[PDB]
Design a protein around this nucleic acid. Structure first.
Ligand SMILES: [Zn+2]
Ligand SMILES: [Zn+2]
Length: 246
DNA sequence: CTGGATCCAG
DNA sequence: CTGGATCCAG
């Protein structure tokens, strides 16, 4: 098994000046080159929409693509529609593909569906109406941005599948309880290095209070959330309010 | 006390 | 059943 990072260069020539070129090329690449980031199965199945599923584990993936520079936002459709889906916990997993002017994939990631929170949905050039949206990847923790290819480097599929499976417990939490765990992961991402203290986490109290406005016991909530993450092997407790990222 | 463990009103 | 609240060991 060898991933080829370039698109089909013959299709590049055939579909020159064709309106659908960029969709044909990206879908083709995902179909032949991607694997299921849950169970590792290759190839995926095709379901207009660029939707795939895994015939082994039934995971679904919808593809989004951007030519050029890696963006911290993924273009979607309507704000209201995306919201209904997010609320109903109904989104597919998302594949995000970025590619160069020479039709090489330089980033390819999966955003597992449960990491798409109301918060991560931002309005695009909003107008009083007409309001598109993006998914804002700066609001998604590293645990929910799982790279199959990163900066032109093909990652170990065993690490991809491990990371994907590690986050699946969040599918069993309801919206706000899931939101808590996801925001704690966002805090931990900001801590520089491997080691951190409870004191480090308490610095985010003000930030967390602004998201979770009804919580008057934020320090205690932080402790509980750290315990959930320990139980899920995402951090370890070294005792006495000291932790290490895993 | 500090911080890991558990709970319950609506 | 949830997520803000309370319990409880060292
Ligand atoms: Zn190539
Ligand atoms: Zn699969």
């Amino acid at each position: 098994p060898h991933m080829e990072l370039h698109f089909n260069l013959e299709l590049v020539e055939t579909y020159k000046s064709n309106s659908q070129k960029a969709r044909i090329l990206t879908e083709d690449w995902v179909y032949r080159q991607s694997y299921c980031p849950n169970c590792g199965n290759n190839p995926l199945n095709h379901f207009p929409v660029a939707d795939f599923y895994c015939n082994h584990c039934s995971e679904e993936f919808e593809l989004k693509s951007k030519k050029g520079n890696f963006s911290s936002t993924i273009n979607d459709g309507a704000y209201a529609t995306m919201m209904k889906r997010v609320q109903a916990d109904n989104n597919p997993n998302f594949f995000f593909l970025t590619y160069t002017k020479n039709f090489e994939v330089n980033n390819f990631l999966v955003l597992p569906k449960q990491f798409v929170t109301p918060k991560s949905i931002i309005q695009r050039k909003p107008l009083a109406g007409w309001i598109g949206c993006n998914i804002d990847l700066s609001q998604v923790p590293s645990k929910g941005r799982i790279f199959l290819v990163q900066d032109g480097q093909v990652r170990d599929p065993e690490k991809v599948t491990k990371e994907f499976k590690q986050g699946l417990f969040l599918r069993k939490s309801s919206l706000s309880s899931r939101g808590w765990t996801i925001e704690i992961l966002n805090c931990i991402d900001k801590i520089e290095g491997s080691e951190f203290t409870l004191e480090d986490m308490y610095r985010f109290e003000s930030d967390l209070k602004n998201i979770f406005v009804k919580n008057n016991h934020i320090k205690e909530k932080i402790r509980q959330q750290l315990q959930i993450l320990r139980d899920k092997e995402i951090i370890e407790f070294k005792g006495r309010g000291k932790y290490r990222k895993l």
